[PDB]
Write a protein that binds this DNA or RNA. Sequence first.
RNA 1: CCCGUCGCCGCGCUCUCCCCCCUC
RNA 2: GAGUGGACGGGAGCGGCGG
RNA 3: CCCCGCGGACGCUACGCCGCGACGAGUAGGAGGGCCGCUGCGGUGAGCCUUGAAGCCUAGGGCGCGGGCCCGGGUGGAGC
Lengths: 63, 225, 240, 128, 53, 125, 109
Amino acid sequence: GVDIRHNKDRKVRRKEPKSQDIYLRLLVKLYRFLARRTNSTFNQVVLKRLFMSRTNRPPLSLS
Amino acid sequence: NFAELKIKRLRKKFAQKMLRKARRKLIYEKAKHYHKEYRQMYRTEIRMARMARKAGNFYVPAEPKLAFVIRIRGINGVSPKVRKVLQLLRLRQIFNGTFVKLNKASINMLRIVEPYIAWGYPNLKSVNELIYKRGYGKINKKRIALTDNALIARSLGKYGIICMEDLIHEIYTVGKRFKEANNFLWPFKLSSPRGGMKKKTTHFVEGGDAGNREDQINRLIRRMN
Amino acid sequence: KGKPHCSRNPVLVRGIGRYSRSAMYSRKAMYKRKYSAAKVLATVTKPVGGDKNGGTRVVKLRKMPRYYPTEDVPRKLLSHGKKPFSQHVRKLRASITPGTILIILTGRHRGKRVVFLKQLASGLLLVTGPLVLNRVPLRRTHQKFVIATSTKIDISNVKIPKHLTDAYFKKKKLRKPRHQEGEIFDTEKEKYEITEQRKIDQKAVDSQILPKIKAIPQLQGYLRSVFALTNGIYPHKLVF
Amino acid sequence: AALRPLVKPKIVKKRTKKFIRHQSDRYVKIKRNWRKPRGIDNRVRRRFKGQILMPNIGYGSNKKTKHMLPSGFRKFLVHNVKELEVLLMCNKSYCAEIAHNVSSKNRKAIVERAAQLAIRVTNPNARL
Amino acid sequence: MACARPLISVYSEKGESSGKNVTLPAVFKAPIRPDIVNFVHTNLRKNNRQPYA
Amino acid sequence: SAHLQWMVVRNCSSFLIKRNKQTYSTEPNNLKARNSFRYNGLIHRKTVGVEPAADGKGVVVVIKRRSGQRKPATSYVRTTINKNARATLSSIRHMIRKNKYRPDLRMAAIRRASAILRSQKPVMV
Amino acid sequence: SGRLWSKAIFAGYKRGLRNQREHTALLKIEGVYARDETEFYLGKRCAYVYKAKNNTVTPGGKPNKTRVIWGKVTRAHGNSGMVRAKFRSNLPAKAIGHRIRVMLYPSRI
RNA sequence: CCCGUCGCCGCGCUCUCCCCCCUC
RNA sequence: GAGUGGACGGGAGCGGCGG
RNA sequence: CCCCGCGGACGCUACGCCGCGACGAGUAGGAGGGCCGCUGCGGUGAGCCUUGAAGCCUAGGGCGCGGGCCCGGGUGGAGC
Ligand SMILES: [Mg+2]
Ligand SMILES: [Mg+2]
Ligand SMILES: [Mg+2]
Ligand SMILES: [Mg+2]
Ligand SMILES: [Mg+2]
Ligand SMILES: [Mg+2]
Ligand SMILES: [Mg+2]
Ligand SMILES: [Mg+2]
Ligand SMILES: [Mg+2]
């Protein structure tokens, strides 16, 4: 036996979009490659926001 | 352009080879230096005691600065304070071992978990055999076997520790980077003691196994790994 | 090309030589042996013969495959040990020396006491408890399946024939070269026949092993008898 | 004789017997199909020694030999010659077999075509 | 591709191209969204149902 | 686009066979007959197909022309190779490698052609 | 012409009091009653030879009713000359108290 | 393109010349 | 394909193979 | 400027494939996956079937951790 707790082992986060939109899935494929094969942290932020739900992607007004 | 890049690649491979020879020669000579240093420390303790006994006085050696702690009890029915200190000593499993730098702060933590541990003062041979046979490094949170010096040099090279000899020297003599070298070491997963124990539930000074046995921890180590 | 030298580094223990890097440097005179900087025809041309047939043909050896399987197996990794059996080192128990009396433990000669002669290239022992004593010819046997007794006959200055090798003793058989479907029985040739050469070698070795067996008293009677376990005797207590 | 697979590794089965339902021996109304016990005092669920064992993921087969027949192939249920053609490039690892409802007249043509394509059929002499 | 608009030919009743051309309507370059189509088809097929009880 | 059309038919197609923990795709120009982006014989601007000859001797190598993608009547060019096995494989190898025409399908087409030609020679009793 | 194997008795399986590991068997070699004497028999082939109803093929002989389960001695058990043995199939429980032959085959003497 | 007997590591010989001992 | 930097475009030089 | 060789395995259903490390008790309860199962509808399988459907029986052969499933034999007689 090992004295550990397993209630936080599984991190809860979006690993992929819950959407079935194939156009969103295609540019997720694009930015999954960009995040992996570059050192840019911009690609990593964009990729994780592509996974995000709509309430986590609020609209941005022109103003 | 085919020949020009061929010259460049061969010259790059040569520069890598000469750097590797230079690194090999360095860790070879560092180990030779450590062999000189270890025997100087061993002979100095003998010489200091000899000159004291010649004068009729006593030579009290320095209190040991390094301990090896083995958890001897299991994970069932442990009090909250003992459980916390064992987690801080990285002993979350029975027969797990770890090196502890000795001072007032660490010793008073060892006294809390005394019924749960057997500890003592490892000698040079115990440190060698623990690192060489059961030495694993915590590399990117993974338990990676220390099969190559490159694993040590990549994570601890910024402290000047680039080989198993440097790691062993930093553990045996406590050194400035004991915390980094020791926390790099994954806690040792020792086997059950071959030949059995006396009594895990009582202290060593009353015929059991718990608590501090000064240099008898080395007998326990030979039987456990 | 210079003539190759011996190792110049004696082996004290397997993997470790007697001399260090600098000691071996001076023994090799590397201080003066410093060196600075500085096929197979796949196709063959052949005349083809014939008017306005072209002069020749560029025939390619090892043409391309004419068929491929639907799928293939990837190649193995490289293992760096794992010699073939013909290149394994051969070991022999210190109790087995040329002339030692052995006790066979398996086979039709189970329990017979034979005379060890030499170890072969495959590690199998060559034995002949002389055929006139216990009906064991020049035969191979495995050292793992014999008991080396402490009684020995000096078989130095005897001459084991050179052709007594593993290839000589290997079983020869031949079945179904032109026969494929079994309806007419192939039960011919089954009787192994002793070669006249085997009879010659048997007499050649026995002619110089027997006079040394007769030298020590009642050893021939010992080799005539077989080994057995009596209900009171135990192998762990026996001295062989 | 029979068409050989590409590779025939040794297949290791962690368990060979079936997981029978608890107390399916004592009753006819209880089929041997496995049901997880959920009684408060159920000693099979509590995993007492000497009891009926419960399926768990540790009994899972090696992924290299999973679903593999003793012959070394993996079956693929076909219903006609057209579905037989998909195994043309999977000859050495997958074997066709004809569905039970296929008639005897039509499963003759499946067997003949499979012999032409070197596809192994598990039930070739099935209606004759 | 999306901005590119081919010139589709009109075929006669005999099956051969009659020589007339109609520029491809822009609706054929619209996004193809099978998840939207499946959603609309799923909910619209419930609209011709008869009640049962 | 090939990738866009793949996202539509990767799991919803009349050629899709999902059975026995296996997946096959049965459209005409699919070497290896597998449901995959690389081997799909409908979604790509250039595909290679190898079929048995109609008369039962030789192979038919069909390739997709570049121009008329939306015109399926003229989009495929078929040729029949009815020579010995080694030269048949050489013609298919030169079709794919020399033309730079879809070189990732070269061994798939060669292996399929070998399977077709082997199925045409007489069976063994 | 002679016995050529030591007499042993299948005493039982390796076990606790209430658990039984049938994959290994404990043998009682005759005349071996101390642990230091069991070193000779380590690694020696052992055979459980029994008879059945149906004939089975015999290597180098006509088919007969003799069958055998092969095994070998692995280590010493206890202080009193017991040994442990692994057979290619676990020994049947009907053989407890019956004869096992220890064959001398892989000899080191 | 008969075939990755390959990497790290530890060694041996040759591209130098003399001898010495068995053996053809 | 060949990347822990390569490219041109002239300065003045070496090291090795082509008197 | 590779060419006496014109040639060179597999792969990547990217919802795929591969690697490394640690871990694995569970009532009440929650969550996920289900190429588990039943019935009916829209599509699809140029699907299956009187040369034999469903159902049922079976000391028959197997697959899966499992829910279950496939196949052989028999009976059955019209659908799956
Ligand atoms: Mg838990
Ligand atoms: Mg307790
Ligand atoms: Mg012990
Ligand atoms: Mg207590
Ligand atoms: Mg099973
Ligand atoms: Mg029941
Ligand atoms: Mg209760
Ligand atoms: Mg556990
Ligand atoms: Mg659990």
